[PDB]
Amino acid sequence: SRQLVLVVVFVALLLDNMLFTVVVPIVPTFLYDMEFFLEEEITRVGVLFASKAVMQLLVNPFVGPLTNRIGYHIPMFAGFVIMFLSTVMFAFSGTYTLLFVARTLQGIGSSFSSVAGLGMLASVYTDDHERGRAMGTALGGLALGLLVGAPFGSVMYEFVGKSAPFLILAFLALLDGALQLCKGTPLFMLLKDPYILVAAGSICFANMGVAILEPTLPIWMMQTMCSPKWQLGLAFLPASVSYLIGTNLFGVLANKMGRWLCSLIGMLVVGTSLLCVPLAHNIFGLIGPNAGLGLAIGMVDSSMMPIMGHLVDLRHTSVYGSVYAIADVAFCMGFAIGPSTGGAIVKAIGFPWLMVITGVINIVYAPLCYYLRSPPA
Amino acid sequence: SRQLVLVVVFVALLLDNMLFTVVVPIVPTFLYDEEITRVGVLFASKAVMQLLVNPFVGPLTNRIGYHIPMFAGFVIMFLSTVMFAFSGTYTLLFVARTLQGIGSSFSSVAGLGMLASVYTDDHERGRAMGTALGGLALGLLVGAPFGSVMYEFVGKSAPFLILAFLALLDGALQLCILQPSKVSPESAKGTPLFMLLKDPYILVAAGSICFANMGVAILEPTLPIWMMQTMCSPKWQLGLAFLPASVSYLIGTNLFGVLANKMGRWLCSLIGMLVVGTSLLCVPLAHNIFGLIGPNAGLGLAIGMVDSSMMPIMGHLVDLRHTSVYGSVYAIADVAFCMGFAIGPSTGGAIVKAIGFPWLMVITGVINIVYAPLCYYLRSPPAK
Numbered sequence A: 001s002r003q004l005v006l007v008v009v010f011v012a013l014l015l016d017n018m019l020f021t022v023v024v025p026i027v028p029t030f031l032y033d034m035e036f037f038l039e040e041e042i043t044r045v046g047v048l049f050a051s052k053a054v055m056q057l058l059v060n061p062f063v064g065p066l067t068n069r070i071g072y073h074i075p076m077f078a079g080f081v082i083m084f085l086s087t088v089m090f091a092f093s094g095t096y097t098l099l100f101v102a103r104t105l106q107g108i109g110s111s112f113s114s115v116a117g118l119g120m121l122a123s124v125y126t127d128d129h130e131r132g133r134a135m136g137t138a139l140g141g142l143a144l145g146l147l148v149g150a151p152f153g154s155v156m157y158e159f160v161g162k163s164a165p166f167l168i169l170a171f172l173a174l175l176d177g178a179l180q181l182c183k184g185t186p187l188f189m190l191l192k193d194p195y196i197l198v199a200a201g202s203i204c205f206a207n208m209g210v211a212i213l214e215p216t217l218p219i220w221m222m223q224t225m226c227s228p229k230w231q232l233g234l235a236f237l238p239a240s241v242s243y244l245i246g247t248n249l250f251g252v253l254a255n256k257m258g259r260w261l262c263s264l265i266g267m268l269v270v271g272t273s274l275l276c277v278p279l280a281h282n283i284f285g286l287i288g289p290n291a292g293l294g295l296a297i298g299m300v301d302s303s304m305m306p307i308m309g310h311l312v313d314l315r316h317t318s319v320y321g322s323v324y325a326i327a328d329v330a331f332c333m334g335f336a337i338g339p340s341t342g343g344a345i346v347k348a349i350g351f352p353w354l355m356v357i358t359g360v361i362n363i364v365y366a367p368l369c370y371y372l373r374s375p376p377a
Numbered sequence B: 001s002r003q004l005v006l007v008v009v010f011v012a013l014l015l016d017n018m019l020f021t022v023v024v025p026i027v028p029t030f031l032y033d034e035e036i037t038r039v040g041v042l043f044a045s046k047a048v049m050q051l052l053v054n055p056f057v058g059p060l061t062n063r064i065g066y067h068i069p070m071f072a073g074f075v076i077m078f079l080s081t082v083m084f085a086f087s088g089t090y091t092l093l094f095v096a097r098t099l100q101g102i103g104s105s106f107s108s109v110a111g112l113g114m115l116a117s118v119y120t121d122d123h124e125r126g127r128a129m130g131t132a133l134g135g136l137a138l139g140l141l142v143g144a145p146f147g148s149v150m151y152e153f154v155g156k157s158a159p160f161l162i163l164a165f166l167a168l169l170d171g172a173l174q175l176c177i178l179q180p181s182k183v184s185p186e187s188a189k190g191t192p193l194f195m196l197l198k199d200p201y202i203l204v205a206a207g208s209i210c211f212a213n214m215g216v217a218i219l220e221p222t223l224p225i226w227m228m229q230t231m232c233s234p235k236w237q238l239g240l241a242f243l244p245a246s247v248s249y250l251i252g253t254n255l256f257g258v259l260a261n262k263m264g265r266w267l268c269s270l271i272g273m274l275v276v277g278t279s280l281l282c283v284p285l286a287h288n289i290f291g292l293i294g295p296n297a298g299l300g301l302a303i304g305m306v307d308s309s310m311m312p313i314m315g316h317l318v319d320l321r322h323t324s325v326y327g328s329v330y331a332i333a334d335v336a337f338c339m340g341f342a343i344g345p346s347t348g349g350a351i352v353k354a355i356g357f358p359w360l361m362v363i364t365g366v367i368n369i370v371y372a373p374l375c376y377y378l379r380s381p382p383a384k
C-alpha cells in the first residue's frame, strides 16, 4: 500500500543514520580495547570515517541510469543486502581491514538506499500535494535516527557488549525488508553558477565542523577529559537536541528576518562554537558549545535549503529532489575531506588548531552570504 | 576616595563630549547665514590634531601624574567653548575646534589612565570603565538636541555659555576632590610607547577598537547624504536617525561592563565585532527610516560590547606583561578612537562619490568580520 512504502522508507533512513552515528563512539573505544598513542592512529581513523563519504561520492551518479534501466525496487533491495552485510561485518569485525570494507559497503548501501527509496517514494505518490508530507515524514525519521543513534551505541557498549547495537540494528533491518518484501538541469550544470556554488560551500563549511569533530572529539576526550567510556556518545546529545530545536524554530523565523542573515548568524555561531570547544576541561563544559553548534547547523540548513530551492527555481528547472543532490554533495564533501584531512592536521598540529582553523574558515566565509540576497539572473 | 575619582571622569567625559556633538547642528547652519567639503574639514580638525598630540600626551602622564593633564583639559575646554560662543567666522571657528580636540585628548587620556590606576582589581576595573563609557554615551546622547533647541530658542552663545558655566562647576569640583596643584611622578618607570607597538596583543586590541570606531565614525558623515539621496526624508529626522545608536551604546556599555568579566572579554569582543559587522552589512539595505532603528541599535550595542571588553583588557595586558604604568596604552586606545573619528568625516563624501556608500559599508563590515577571529589571541596571553 501507499503507507507501506512510507514506513519502509522511514525505517531505511532511520537505520542508515543510526549506523552512521553508532559507528562513531565504538571505533575509538574498540581501538582502545584491543591494545590492552592514538596520535599515530588518528589519521587512519579519519580515513576510515571518510571512506563511506568518498565511496558515496563516486557512487551517486551511476545510480541514475541504473534506476531507469532496472526500476526502483531492485536498487532498493540491493541497498538492503549491502547494509545487512555491513551490519553483520561490523559486529564480527576484529580487524581494521574488515572495518574499512564494511565502511565502503556502508557508503554503497547508503547511496543506493537513499536514491532508490526517494525515487520510489516519488513514484508512489502522484497526488502532487502529499509528496511533500511524505518527504517531511522521511526527513523527520532521519532527524530522529540522528537523535537516537548516539545514545544507543554509547550506552549499549559497556553494558551489554560490543556486538549488541549492530545485531539489534540488523534485526530491526530484517523487520524492514519483511515490510518491503511484500526532469532536467543535471547536477554538473547546476554547479556552473557562483550563487549555487557559494550556497553549497556554505552548507559544506557548516557541516564540516561536526564532520571534523566526529573523528577527533572522542580521542580528545580519552586523552584529556578522562570521561567514562559510556559517556562518549552521550557527549554529542546537545548537537542533536539543539539541532532539532533549531531546525524547527528557525524555519518560521527564517522568512521573517531574511535567509541570508540566518545563514550569516549561523556561520558566526558555528565558528564561535568551534573556537569555544577546545577549552572545556570536563564533559559538562561541552554542553554549551555543542548545543550552540547544533543550533547553528540547524539555522544554516533551515536558511540555505530554501535559498537553494529558490536559486534552482528562479534560473533553472528543478525536480522533486533536485535540491537533494546539491546538498548531499556538500555533505559527502565535508564527510570525505574533514575526516581525511583531519587526521593529518591533528598529527601535524594539535586538535585546538584544527578547531581554530575550521572556525576561522567559517568566519571568513560568513561575509560571502551577502551574494545570495535577491540574486538576479 | 577611590569612588570619587570615577565621578570626576564621569563628568569630565560628559562635558567634553557634549561640545563634540552640540556643535554638529549649529555650525553649518550658522555659516550659511565643494562647499560641503570645507564644512566637513571643520569637524575633522579635532580628530587630526588630537592624533598628533596623543603620542606627546601619553608619556607626559608618567612624569607629572594624571591630575595636571585633566586640569589643563578643563582649562582648554573652557577656552574652546567660550571662543565658540563669540567667534562668527571660519578662521575663528577652526582654532576653537582644534582647541576642543586638544582638550578632549587631555581629558580622555588622563581620565582613562586615572580610572585604570585607582581601580586595581580586574573585575572591579571592568566596571568603572563601563560606567565612564556610559557617561560618555549619555553626553553624546544629550549633546545634539540640546544644541538644536538652544539655538532655536535661546540663541547661539547660550548653549556654549551654559557649557562654560558647567565647565566652571567642573573645575570647582576638580579643585575640591583631586587637588591638581602639584606634579607627582609615578614611581614605576612606564614602558616606552614604541616597544608597545611590538606587542601583538596590544596591536590586536587597538585594532579591534580602531575598526569598531571606524565603523561608527564612517557612518555618521556618510549616512545623512545617502538619506537625502535615497529616501527623501525631512531634515528634522536626520539627527533622530542616529539616536538609537547612542541609546544602545549607553545601555550596552553599562550592561556589558557588568558582565564582560563573567562572560569573557575575548568572547564579548568577538561577538561585538561580529554583530557590528553584520549591522553595518544590513545598514545600507534600509528602504525607510523605520528600518534603521534595528541595525543602528545593534551597531551601538556592538560597539559598547567591544569597548567595555577591550577597554580594561589593555590594562590587563599591560599588567600581565609590561610594567604597571597605564598612560601609553590608553593613549594608544585614544589614538585608535581619534583615527577612526578622523578618517571618516573628511573622506566620507570622497569615498561615497568614488565607490558608493553600500560598498563602503560592505568593506568595513567584512574587515570587522575577518578581524573578529584575531580576538581569540587575547584569550590567555603569556606573562613575562
Ligand SMILES: COC(=O)[C@H]1[C@H]2C[C@@H]3c4[nH]c5cc(OC)ccc5c4CCN3C[C@H]2C[C@@H](OC(=O)c2cc(OC)c(OC)c(OC)c2)[C@@H]1OC
Pocket (backbone or CB within 6 Å): A017, A020, A021, A024, A139, A142, A143, A146, A150, A207, A210, A214, A236, A239, A240, A243, A294, A297, A305, A323, A324, A325, A327, A328, A331
Ligand atoms: C549523519 O548523517 C547525516 O549526514 C545527517 C546529519 C549530519 C549532521 C550531524 N551528524 C551528527 C552526528 C552526531 O553524533 C556524533 C551528532 C550530531 C550530528 C549532526 C548534527 C548536524 N547534522 C545534520 C544531520 C541532518 C541530515 O540532513 C538532513 O536532515 C536533510 C535535510 C534536508 O532538508 C530538510 C534535505 O533536503 C531535502 C536533505 O537532503 C539533501 C537532508 C544529514 O544527512 C542525511
Ligand SMILES: NCCc1c[nH]c2ccc(O)cc12
Pocket (backbone or CB within 6 Å): B021, B140, B213, B216, B220, B242, B245, B246, B249, B300, B303
Ligand atoms: N565612541 C562611541 C562612538 C559613537 C557612538 N554613538 C555615537 C554618536 C555620535 C557620534 O558622533 C559618535 C558616536
